Scaffold this active site. Structure first.
Site, PDB file in Angstrom:
ATOM      1  N   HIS A  46       0.827  -1.227   0.000  1.00  0.00           N
ATOM      2  CA  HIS A  46       0.000   0.000   0.000  1.00  0.00           C
ATOM      3  C   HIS A  46       0.864   1.283   0.000  1.00  0.00           C
ATOM      4  O   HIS A  46       0.403   2.335  -0.451  1.00  0.00           O
ATOM      5  CB  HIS A  46      -1.007   0.010   1.163  1.00  0.00           C
ATOM      6  CG  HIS A  46      -0.537   0.569   2.464  1.00  0.00           C
ATOM      7  ND1 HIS A  46      -0.425  -0.238   3.589  1.00  0.00           N
ATOM      8  CD2 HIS A  46      -0.331   1.857   2.835  1.00  0.00           C
ATOM      9  CE1 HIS A  46      -0.082   0.566   4.579  1.00  0.00           C
ATOM     10  NE2 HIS A  46      -0.016   1.832   4.181  1.00  0.00           N
ATOM     11  N   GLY A 196       2.180   6.468   8.842  1.00  0.00           N
ATOM     12  CA  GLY A 196       3.613   6.755   8.704  1.00  0.00           C
ATOM     13  C   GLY A 196       4.463   5.611   9.214  1.00  0.00           C
ATOM     14  O   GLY A 196       5.627   5.457   8.834  1.00  0.00           O
ATOM     15  N   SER A 198       3.464   2.484   8.590  1.00  0.00           N
ATOM     16  CA  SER A 198       3.198   1.403   7.625  1.00  0.00           C
ATOM     17  C   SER A 198       4.453   0.886   7.009  1.00  0.00           C
ATOM     18  O   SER A 198       5.413   1.643   6.854  1.00  0.00           O
ATOM     19  CB  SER A 198       2.260   1.861   6.522  1.00  0.00           C
ATOM     20  OG  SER A 198       0.989   2.161   7.056  1.00  0.00           O
TER      21      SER A 198
HETATM   22  C1  1UP Z   1      -3.596   6.225   6.647  1.00  0.00           C
HETATM   23  O1  1UP Z   1      -3.411   6.100   8.061  1.00  0.00           O
HETATM   24  C2  1UP Z   1      -2.906   4.913   8.570  1.00  0.00           C
HETATM   25  C3  1UP Z   1      -2.092   3.968   7.803  1.00  0.00           C
HETATM   26  C4  1UP Z   1      -1.652   2.806   8.380  1.00  0.00           C
HETATM   27  C5  1UP Z   1      -1.952   2.494   9.737  1.00  0.00           C
HETATM   28  C6  1UP Z   1      -1.460   1.259  10.292  1.00  0.00           C
HETATM   29  C7  1UP Z   1      -1.751   0.926  11.588  1.00  0.00           C
HETATM   30  C8  1UP Z   1      -2.558   1.809  12.420  1.00  0.00           C
HETATM   31  C9  1UP Z   1      -2.777   1.425  13.878  1.00  0.00           C
HETATM   32  N1  1UP Z   1      -3.884   1.904  14.517  1.00  0.00           N
HETATM   33  N2  1UP Z   1      -1.911   0.672  14.409  1.00  0.00           N
HETATM   34  C10 1UP Z   1      -3.046   3.007  11.905  1.00  0.00           C
HETATM   35  C11 1UP Z   1      -2.745   3.392  10.545  1.00  0.00           C
HETATM   36  C12 1UP Z   1      -3.232   4.643   9.911  1.00  0.00           C
HETATM   37  O2  1UP Z   1      -4.061   5.509  10.601  1.00  0.00           O
HETATM   38  C13 1UP Z   1      -5.422   5.066  10.655  1.00  0.00           C
HETATM   39  C14 1UP Z   1      -6.404   6.088  10.050  1.00  0.00           C
HETATM   40  N3  1UP Z   1      -5.961   6.942   9.046  1.00  0.00           N
HETATM   41  O3  1UP Z   1      -7.592   6.115  10.432  1.00  0.00           O
END
Ligand code: 1UP
Length: 246
Positions: A46, A196, A198
């Protein structure tokens, strides 16, 4: 990383910092990754799927700061960007969220292991740690969901693995989280990975040995109640990793 602690690359020497070059010369941070062999970094598809031009990416090993040079860091280009052919994204769930980055220096060489640059062992098949085991995550991701900037210093935290049955509960992710995914969170929901982070490692100590058990993939918000971090379960992808690294 929400909560946790500031750290340096000597505590996470397999951590890879991946950036993208933009037209005009600006470079921004993309995702984390992990060094699994001197020529190969493993991350999440992704991270790269909307910008699949391998020439745009820069990867650092032995780097502790986001916009600063760490003594002993090494810079690489991507010789080969391999995305999982069956990667897909639902509203929340990311499927086959794994990628491989074949790295090379400008001299054409792979990583040189050192005190701050080391590989992370891959897990064995059908042998993941039991739910409740504490594992570490690392990244340059957000410190708060409301932040629009990333921390300048690398962070780390410890989370606990959550069983598939618990993670499939309706207040959690239901049938959206699959057996190819691994959930991990803080029992108090105060610390987590976030946007960030990821592509970065979920490292578990299994039978006294450090292993790349997961890859940061997805989650609903960050450090939200009943919303664990969801990780690509690396042990399912060992046939795919072995086939694309040769
Ligand atoms: C695009 O934003 C991301 C992208 C990857 C993620 C990967 C994991 C987590 C987590 N809650 N551990 C949140 C993430 C994340 O935030 C969640 C969101 N935007 O709601």
């Amino acid at each position: 990383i929400i909560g946790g602690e500031f750290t340096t690359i000597e505590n996470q020497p397999w951590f890879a910092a991946i950036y993208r070059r933009h037209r005009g010369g600006s470079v921004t941070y993309v995702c984390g990754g992990s060094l699994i062999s001197p020529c190969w970094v493993i991350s999440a598809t992704h991270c790269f799927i909307d910008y699949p031009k391998k020439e745009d990416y820069i990867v650092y090993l032995g780097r502790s700061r986001l916009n600063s040079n760490t003594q002993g860091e090494m810079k690489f280009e991507v010789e080969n960007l391999i995305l999982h052919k069956d990667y897909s994204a639902d509203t929340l769930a990311h499927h086959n969220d794994i990628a491989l980055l074949k790295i090379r220096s400008k001299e054409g060489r792979c990583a040189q292991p050192s005190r701050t640059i080391q590989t992370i062992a891959l897990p064995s098949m059908y042998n993941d740690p039991q739910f409740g085991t504490s594992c570490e995550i690392t990244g340059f991701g957000k410190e708060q969901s409301t932040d629009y900037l990333y921390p300048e210093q690398l962070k780390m935290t410890v989370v606990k693995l959550i069983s598939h049955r618990e993670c499939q509960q309706p207040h959690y992710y239901g049938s959206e989280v699959t057996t190819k995914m691994l959930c991990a969170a803080d029992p108090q929901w105060k610390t987590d990975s976030c946007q960030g982070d990821s592509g970065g490692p979920l490292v578990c100590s299994l039978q006294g040995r450090m292993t790349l058990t997961g890859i940061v993939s997805w989650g609903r918000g960050c450090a939200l109640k009943d919303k664990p971090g969801v990780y690509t379960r690396v042990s399912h992808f060992l046939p795919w990793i072995r086939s694309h690294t040769k």
